[PDB]
From a paper:
The carboxysome sequesters the key CO2-fixing enzyme, ribulose 1,5-bisphosphate carboxylase/oxygenase (Rubisco), and carbonic anhydrase (CA), using a polyhedral protein shell. CcmM35 contains 3 SSUL domains that interact with Rubisco, whereas [name] has an N-terminal γ-CA-like domain that has been suggested to interact with β-CA, in addition to 3 C-terminal SSUL domains.
We further determined the structure of Rubisco within native Syn7942 β-carboxysomes at a resolution of 3.5 Å using STA. This density matches the [name]-like (SSUL) module of the “linker” protein CcmM, which contains 2 α-helices packed against a β-sheet. We thus deduced that one copy of CcmM SSUL can bind to the RbcL groove in either the up or down configuration, but not both. Although each Rubisco has 4 CcmM SSUL-binding sites, our data suggest that the SSUL domains have low occupancy on individual Rubiscos, which might provide the foundation for the formation of Rubisco condensates and their organizational flexibility.
Residue numbers in the entry:
A (entry chain I), B (entry chain R), C (entry chain S), D (entry chain H): 20 to 65, 68 to 331, 338 to 403, 412 to 461
E (entry chain O), F (entry chain L): 8 to 108
G (entry chain F): 225 to 310
The structure:
Amino acid sequence: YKLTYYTPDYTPKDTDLLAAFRFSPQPGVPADEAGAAIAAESSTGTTVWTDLLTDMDRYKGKCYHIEPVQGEENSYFAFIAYPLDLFEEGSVTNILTSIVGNVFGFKAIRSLRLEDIRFPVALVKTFQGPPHGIQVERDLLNKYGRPMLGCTIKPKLGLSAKNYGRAVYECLRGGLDFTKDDENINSQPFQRWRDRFLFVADAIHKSQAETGEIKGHYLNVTAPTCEEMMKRAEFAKELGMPIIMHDFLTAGFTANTTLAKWCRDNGVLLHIHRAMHAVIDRQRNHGIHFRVLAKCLRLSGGDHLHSGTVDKASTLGFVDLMREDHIEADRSRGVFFTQDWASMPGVLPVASGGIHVWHMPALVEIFGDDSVLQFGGNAPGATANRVALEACVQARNEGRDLYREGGDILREAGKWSPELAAALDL
Amino acid sequence: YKLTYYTPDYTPKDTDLLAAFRFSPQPGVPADEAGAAIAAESSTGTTVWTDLLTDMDRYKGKCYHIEPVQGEENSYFAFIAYPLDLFEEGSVTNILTSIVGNVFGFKAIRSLRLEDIRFPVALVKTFQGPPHGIQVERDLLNKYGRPMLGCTIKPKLGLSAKNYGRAVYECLRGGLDFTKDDENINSQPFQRWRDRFLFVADAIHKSQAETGEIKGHYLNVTAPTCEEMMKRAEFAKELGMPIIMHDFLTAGFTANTTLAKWCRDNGVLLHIHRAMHAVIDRQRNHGIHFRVLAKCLRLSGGDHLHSGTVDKASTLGFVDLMREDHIEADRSRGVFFTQDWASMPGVLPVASGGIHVWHMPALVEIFGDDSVLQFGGNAPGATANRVALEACVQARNEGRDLYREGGDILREAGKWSPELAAALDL
Amino acid sequence: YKLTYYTPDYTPKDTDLLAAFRFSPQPGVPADEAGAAIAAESSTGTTVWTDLLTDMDRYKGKCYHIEPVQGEENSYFAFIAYPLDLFEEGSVTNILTSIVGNVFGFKAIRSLRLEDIRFPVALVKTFQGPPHGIQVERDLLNKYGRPMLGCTIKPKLGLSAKNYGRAVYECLRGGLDFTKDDENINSQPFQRWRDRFLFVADAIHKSQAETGEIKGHYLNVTAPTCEEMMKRAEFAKELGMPIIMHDFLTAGFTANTTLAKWCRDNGVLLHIHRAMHAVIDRQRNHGIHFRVLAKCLRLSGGDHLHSGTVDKASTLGFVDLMREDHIEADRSRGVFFTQDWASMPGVLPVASGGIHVWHMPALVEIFGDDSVLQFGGNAPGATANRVALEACVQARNEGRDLYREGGDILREAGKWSPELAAALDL
Amino acid sequence: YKLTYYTPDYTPKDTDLLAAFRFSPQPGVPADEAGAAIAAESSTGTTVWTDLLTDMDRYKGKCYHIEPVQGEENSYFAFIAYPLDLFEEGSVTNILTSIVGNVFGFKAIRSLRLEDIRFPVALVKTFQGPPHGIQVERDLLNKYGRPMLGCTIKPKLGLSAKNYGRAVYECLRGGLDFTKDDENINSQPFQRWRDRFLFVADAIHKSQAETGEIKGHYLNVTAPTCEEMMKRAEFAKELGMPIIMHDFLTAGFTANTTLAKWCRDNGVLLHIHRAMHAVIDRQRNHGIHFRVLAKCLRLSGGDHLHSGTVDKASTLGFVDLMREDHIEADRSRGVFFTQDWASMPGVLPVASGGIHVWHMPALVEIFGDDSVLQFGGNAPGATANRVALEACVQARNEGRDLYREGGDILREAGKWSPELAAALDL
Amino acid sequence: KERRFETFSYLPPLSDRQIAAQIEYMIEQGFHPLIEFNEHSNPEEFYWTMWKLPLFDCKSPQQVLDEVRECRSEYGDCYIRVAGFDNIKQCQTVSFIVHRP
Amino acid sequence: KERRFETFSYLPPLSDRQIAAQIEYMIEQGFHPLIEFNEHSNPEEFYWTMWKLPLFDCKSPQQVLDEVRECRSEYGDCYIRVAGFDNIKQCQTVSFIVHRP
Amino acid sequence: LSSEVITQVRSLLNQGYRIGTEHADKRRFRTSSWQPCAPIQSTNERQVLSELENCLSEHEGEYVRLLGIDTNTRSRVFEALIQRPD
């Protein structure tokens, strides 16, 4: 098995797929054998008469490198290369199905977690990517030089479409760029989506007109079926709605790719929610680390993604991963393999979970203008948050260290900002 | 929190939805507050001015009872109640979105573990469910008073479309009921799906001519996008294929339900692979349990379901759940909740994994006639598999206890059958 | 110019597209400047305000070597590299448009002569390629171990569709694998296509019945309009036709690539004709080389391609390119570069132009079984042709030298074969 | 050969298609016998039993005039007749396949060209022709009395779709009626088509509202495949875009002809780009001269067409062939035949390549008010170039000789125009 | 009335010092000034009219400042925007206002 | 009546020596033999019934002949065919007839 | 060993790259099929050269390809086809 699926002297070709697997093998199995097995399940499973009709070699998965984990015991990293022939072109689903379809179900490993994939350039070009990307997103929105502002309507359930739209209006008009559906809401009896849509669209139109600023609300189109999701997306289009939302991980990667195609062709900005993700990623010792899901998402296509409320190094790592077109390998931020996204646009990172507008200078320093900030809702509050955003943007923009002066900028801003003076009081 | 969401005395409405949570809170947090929080993050999250424009009271996650886990420390079972209005009708995606969207990322829990839901008969009644059901499938296929036989094609990849179909034909003429795609094979460059389907279809036809028993192969249709799935499914149907195969976790639950509708309208049996399910179930402290996935899928619809090779208790519980119309709560076999499905048709379980025909009599003992046994393969081996199956069924019928007599049974069966005798030599 | 485009020490990346340009600078034009200039023409041409809103860096074409031609004067092979990012994915029309769209008209160069291009792997993976490929072709057509036969109906014009079938029928029954339309013959007022379709199809069907071998004709679909070309296409489908034919130089590449997509979707072999080519290729000091077109074609997608009756060395070069997965650089056989195709299936060579079967043992030697042979028309003649082919196949597999021993083989075949005896007697 | 394909005394029928050829034969072959052959392989190729079931003599390509080329040795001009029945109604591709498909490969000619065809009025009719032509295009644009004026958008590649719409805005507000894509731009990954189209569309709407005169940009719809190519045409129509681009050599004829019908059906002007045009007609000894291409285009259809930069006498020849509806046979202009065009509406020629605004008096006295004068870049330069245009138009109209007074008029214009003064300064 | 501008328009009207410091840091990262003007500011309106060239050969913010004097002085009832363009990243990173009627 | 077959069908029925030669050539090019059959011969009917194994550990043609003899002893009224597969090129490379009823 | 190969392997070793070799017959070489060779675990030029020459001699009349490997990155930095059957 090691003799068949451990080739320590092999080095991957640029057209291979490299998968980093963190594993704590079951007692009695040496670590090398365990990495040969891992390589085996996903790239062969396993004799049979049919075996020799084909050239086995071409279609094997090699674990070309095994190391232990620094400062952990019973722990190693496997780095395994994959021939490009193994997967259908442009299909995230198939990739996942081959790599992690059954290796997870194996017995010898006590716990396994997929760490990162290095999708070969060639394989990246088979996925259209984010429907618009950051740059096209900025151009369509015509907003520049500051991280975006997003808020969620509360409570998550009970509001009338007319009242819900009320809330959305107050949130936008107070000076938030963006509003969002809650991931849960698709057609609940209390709110059916089409009346939701017509209300909230008219609210964004009126906030547009009054502001003179392009406004955006994330309309969910996660739907029980493909055809349903097509209708909601269509009906978002027809109302001039500049953005929608989907819950990829629940609904599907194939549906998400579908949405990617539709929106790309229809020029529609896409936001992606990140429901369920903790079911897979929460545990550092098993499952899949979220950076994989991020890279798979951007291969599938999406212009936004929840990046969490914030390990900060691994944040920066995979956030870069899903912005910068080229990343170098580095283990302090977690990055396992150098990846080239072939000029492909990156995705906007979205910060949520009580962004605590007194922490907003922290986030602005962390992430840069290429990032979206989400509050987790009255017009003064949204004004205050926007003021602060702008005030901190100016301060870094004249050269000020945001970190150390964030409070000083807030007080300055609140001097000339009543609403922000009151929000600071809070 | 507890003052509003913990209701230890509340009794749940038939029209509520109940979720089972095993969980370990972080040190310091009391269990009650932990369950209260669990419930909150699933329902309402957290005040705003819009809160009290609804009857706030109406739309809770009501954590209404708790216990510690016997023989474990800091691990407690929570049951939470959910009004029916929380959810859209017919949307598997939505139910999973709210149950587990974000609660798994809630910090104060050490670990969280979704184990069961009891879908109210009303909420059941809106899903289409399996396209045909067990009985209607058996009526279609004519296969009676026994489980069905499946062999997966090996090696998983490499084989030419022509060879792949050659192997199909071998396996089918030897007497297997079915043959399946590897979940991975969708369009790999060395096999274009269309040529594969043509090969397979012509092979089944000619085997069915030979044999005079309904033959079909589980053709995978998982595709990068919805349109590609619909095309492949159209094609499949144009050849008279009786069944297809789909990978609902990887592809998703929306795309799955689409396919289940289309099949219901197109007469086409549906097979479900559970690839990746390990990523969600394997660990015993975190994740969503395979039984829940089974609920959610049979609500969605599918005629087969992998269920493992075979804790035997859990296996026997959730296969009965997915088979029978009414089951009763049994903590020993894992069935927390008493569920009724209002006569909605069942699904056939599937067991695979190199299933060691020596152990098959155990498998018939465990599972009963309405099941499918898949094997991970030449014509003689399939004939040996079939004769052993038929002998075993005959023996069970007669009265010989399968557990104590299986070896002997295989003795007598092999004495007159050479292919079985050779297989048993192995 | 030369200060920038000419980057002698520049190492090509795996992600660049490489082109070989034989060119004759006007007298007084230095070679180096000529190569810079050719690199600019096809990369950027030439400052205006907008020039510095872009990083010119990333998007220059780079001439990294010049050489003088051995045994020729004032002529120099140029090699230029391009970044991948200049190219829309999956557009051969864009390939051509950028390489050759303006360079040819450049006034500093007495003659410009494209020779060779290298496609990087990633840009490969963006095209579909041939609808089925060699092996899937052979699998659908169920013939093996031999190259195929083709005859062209004559006279090209005036045969009534009934007559024209009648000729088709005699050709096929005498033992040709294929008949073919002629590039010109599309719906002439004397031959409307519909009726031609109907009669030829029925003639294949009845020949297949009589002979019991899979017969096919090459049905032209080149049409004035995309939609015409379609309707022709489907109606060839409805008759079960296994293969069609398209002239793509005259029609272009975008229509051809559509047609390859259609056919890949519908299971239909796509023969290629290769008319208007000597307008480009025949001349040796100016134009585009047939290997390039053949690359480009097959990237578009096509099952058959003419390569010439047969410089035999250039023939071997491009043939070995358009069939094998990997080929190595050979200036003796005209392959400038080293190419890889990542298991993308190759395309079958076709030879026409009075094959004159007494030279056929030469052709089998040259090309091998993976090839097709066009005859430039009665049932005995076709029989004789086929008998010779089979005899030579047999002899070659017997280890007897084809070259030396052709005449002896052909005698021994004729002794027992009156219809080959007569054919040789001509 | 001669005795059947040489008819010196044959006066062509009105309905005949005539194709003039320039050829240099091999040593040994007399000119007449080369002429009989050239005739031959284009129509009949070469005997077979299917021969006497046909009227050969009817569909024979008859060579009825051979002359030597004056002042040249080993060169001669051939005229060959080809019955109208010889090509498919309204199919450009098929005529080029027939006339020029393999005749370039006939070994007995050292070099050949197609120099002209006479498209007979009856064969003229069938082709849909330009979507709009000159007079309707002028109508649709409301412009008369002067030729239109364009700039090319530079740099050819590297912009962001927002920047490319900026540039376009500045060129249109400059005083150019029109702007254009670069032919090397359809979907480049850094800047996608849908962003481009939206941007440029916005930019024109802004220009029109700013000036109140028809403003527009030649947008590029050339695609990998027909289907996306319709989709581009549709999207462009959706934005009120006046006119688009095509590359009729890289995507071929049936593509442009599709677009010609589609445009005529859609009221959206068409441009034709000539990428690769130097590949065919460039040399003085071989290929096809460019007016054939132009004429074929006029048949197929396009509003616009590049004519280069500017020999002269032939220039005017084919310019006239593509504007007037009867041009007398004129050798010295390279008009070999008289072309009754049936009232077929003419094409607006497009002159480009750094049009050197100083030289417009000669340009447009060459090309006339019915011409489009496209420039290879800020607002002032374009305004100056409109100045100069209007000055020269007035000066001719009131009676002034441009060829001699171009400097005088230009200066006089520049006296009141500081922008044309700054332009003559450079 | 409440019409607002996309970046910084929640802060006080940019004083000469503030604009100068914006430009200064813009140039610290290689951004060269742009100036465009419009009589309106509509959120749908991406494009404005260009100020007779972009100042690609910037060395001090003061030149752009006196440029904006003059843009005022000829279009003093029209809106004035400044921008910068990342030709490396191919991203526009600044767009904000300096003049209102 | 006139029924033909794919490869070599227009040659005289192969002699054992000729079949050996062809098998020999297969061996030296490494294409292990596959023997397959069907009581009828239909061109549409792509597949045939394989003769209980493909002989990968083939060293001599005489084993493949002896296999063929066993098949005709059991199915002498059935067409018999031998195939060669190139596991490296992933292509069927041989297919011709050895027996007819 | 040829001089040009010698000068390549010197350049590779100077930089600190490791050396590896892969072998394949004419049919696998057609299909980009390569197999691992005996590992060259030595940084000294002389010992490397000797083991390469021994590996060439091992696989007479088969395609041999020489490569440059960066241990730290574990990625390939050079491709070179050193030997051919003829």
